[PDB]
Amino acid sequence: SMTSHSWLCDGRLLCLHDPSNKNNWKIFRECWKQGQPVLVSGVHKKLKSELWKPEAFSQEFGDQDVDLVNCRNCAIISDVKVRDFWDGFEIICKRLRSEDGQPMVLKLKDWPPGEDFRDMMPTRFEDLMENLPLPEYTKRDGRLNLASRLPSYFVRPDLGPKMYNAYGLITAEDRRVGTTNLHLDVSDAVNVMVYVGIPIGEGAHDEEVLKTIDEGDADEVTKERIHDHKEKPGALWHIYAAKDAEKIRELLRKVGEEQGQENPPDHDPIHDQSWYLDQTLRKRLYEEYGVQGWAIVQFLGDAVFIPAGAPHQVHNLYSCIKVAEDFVSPEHVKHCFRLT
Ligand SMILES: CCOC(=O)C1CCN(c2cnccn2)CC1
Ligand SMILES: [Cl-]
Ligand SMILES: [Cl-]
Ligand SMILES: [Cl-]
Ligand SMILES: [Cl-]
């Protein structure tokens, strides 16, 4: 009747199979205490699938004004209607075009804005918050979430959740670009893939996706989820242990200098959110600094748990809708303390 869990990343990543199992914490807490990320599959089967479609967001919210980002060159597209984003999510012939006349790979910036998700989308808020895995950690009032219980000596997360909406990266050149560049968060996070859109028009794009996963260092069991079970892959993540953050900063200072950037010796390339670690940079991190990460493919309905302090980057394989909630576990509270 389905096994409790399996392993990815050759034994280094816990994958829980039943999102609402009351005994998940017993397997989870040992991996979490060691500063590892955790994957939980099957959250899509708990949700009302009609609430998470791109066509519904366009119909209900299409007249709101927003900014977009061109993922290929970081150009900002200012003050457009949110339908201009949603109507091109899966239909390539409807996307905003760059000067070269190609359809753009776009990210929708800060939408819903700030802490407004609950007010703007109360039925979505309920559906997500009631079906989050590890609820004693992840609910606003969970017994193991210290977010509402800490004094001002700790950086507290904003009221969530936050939605992350972007097209898939397409070409061989796109393999070196991030959807979200390398950064870290002082809080813990759970990120849920609630919808994956595989386009039509330039549909037949299956093969660059396989080369991206393979070159991305994905394990053999992860490759079997496509070929054997035909699940929809959304996004390729690289996550690094919080303890390796300074070694990553040293690599990126050296590369910034090799590329003729002019940066003070103390500047923080992870906080700048300006780098994506491509195959060349990931190999250099392993070979020159001794640092190994976790390469994670987030499929429809996968919840990725990212530990406080852990540097991480995201590369969309197809068009994705992700919803994330921040929390403060007792295992990782040291990462948000304002002294020493
Ligand atoms: C509704 C799921 O049905 C089952 O029979 C479960 C499947 C998942 N599992 C556990 C057990 N402990 C912790 C976490 N998961 C084993 C039994
Ligand atoms: Cl830690
Ligand atoms: Cl709603
Ligand atoms: Cl729990
Ligand atoms: Cl970014």
Ligand SMILES: [Mn+2]
């Ligand atoms: Mn993050």
